Amino acid sequence: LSFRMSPTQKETRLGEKVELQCELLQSGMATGCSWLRHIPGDDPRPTFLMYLSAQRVKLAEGLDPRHISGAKVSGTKFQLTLSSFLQEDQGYYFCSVVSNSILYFSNFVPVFLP
Amino acid sequence: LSFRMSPTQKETRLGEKVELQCELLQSGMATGCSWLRHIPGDDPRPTFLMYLSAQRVKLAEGLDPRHISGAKVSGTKFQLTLSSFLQEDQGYYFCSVVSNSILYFSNFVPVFLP
């Protein structure tokens, strides 16, 4: 499964809104999509952020919905929004879709401060 | 020494990721591999893009790792990735390997816009 990322990278600033989108290049394989991010550090694992579908956005435990959310824009377009960028928001953002029990990952989007 | 290219060709779009792979079909001949490009026009010469190996990717001087990179992914498989396709990324991509002072070249992979 292929995705197009809009934008493909972002240099942001503290306090700024950041809006990311991933677009599935094929439809009908899933109704939902997850956003994840990898935080630079010694832990190589990604961090689950949210699951987006026809239902309300489901945020990862402990996340502030005032700060981070997302939306299913269409059957193939998914959006993530950071309302006011914080230092800890820096990382590599990507989408994941499960289809036929296979985890697929979009390309990653580096979102960093100067 | 022969190469297998995956894919053999690609029609891309602006802002899409492009991932190419070339696999050496004979083991034990080289542990490194170069990606080159040919663009018809004013300079027919093979243009060096990167040398992949056990070491970090060695990009040609002037290339931006935020746009172009690659990786050695097995003993024989080598990959080139464009993060966001640009008009200027169009052309014929191919791999080259040296073994016992003998230069080898893969088939050309056309990567173009509609």
Residue numbers in the entry:
A (entry chain A), B (entry chain B): 2 to 115
Article passage:
CD8 is expressed on the T-cell surface as dimers in two isoforms, the CD8αα homodimer and the CD8αβ heterodimer; both consist of an extracellular immunoglobulin variable (IgV) domain, a stalk region, a transmembrane domain and a cytoplasmic tail. Here, we report the high-resolution crystal structures of chicken, swine and bovine CD8α and confirm that they are capable of forming homodimers. All of them are CD8αα homodimers, and each CD8α exhibited a typical IgV architecture consisting of two anti-parallel sheets. Our results suggest that although CD8α and MHC I sequences change drastically during co-evolution, a few conserved key residues ensure that the CD8α forms dimers and interacts with p/MHC I during at least the co-evolution of endotherm species.
Three extracellular Ig-like domains of chicken, swine and bovine CD8α (cCD8α, sCD8α and bCD8α) were crystallized and diffracted to 2.0 Å, 1.8 Å and 1.8 Å, respectively. The sheets of CD8α are composed of 10 β strands, but there are 11 β strands in sCD8α and bCD8α because their A and G strands are divided into two separate parts. The two artiodactyl CD8αα dimers also have some distinct structural characteristics, and the most notable feature is that they have an additional A’ strand. The two artiodactyl sCD8αα can be discriminated from each other by certain characteristics, such as the longer A’ strand and shorter complementarity determining region 2 (CDR2) loop in sCD8αα. The buried surface areas (BSAs) of cCD8αα, sCD8αα, bCD8αα, mouse CD8αα (mCD8αα), rhesus macaque CD8αα (rCD8αα) and human CD8αα (hCD8αα) are 828.3 Å2, 979.6 Å2, 928.7 Å2, 1048.7 Å2, 1105.5 Å2 and 1026.3 Å2, respectively, indicating that they are tightly binding dimers. The BSAs of sCD8αα and bCD8αα are similar, but there are six hydrogen bonds in sCD8αα and only two hydrogen bonds in bCD8αα, indicating that CD8α dimerization does not mainly rely on hydrogen bonds. The Q residue on the C strand is involved in the formation of hydrogen bonds in five CD8αα dimers, but it was substituted by H in bCD8α, and no hydrogen bond is formed at this location in bCD8αα. The numbers of residues composing the cCD8αα, sCD8αα and bCD8αα cavities are 7, 7 and 9, and their volumes are 202.0 Å3, 322.9 Å3 and 384.6 Å3, respectively.
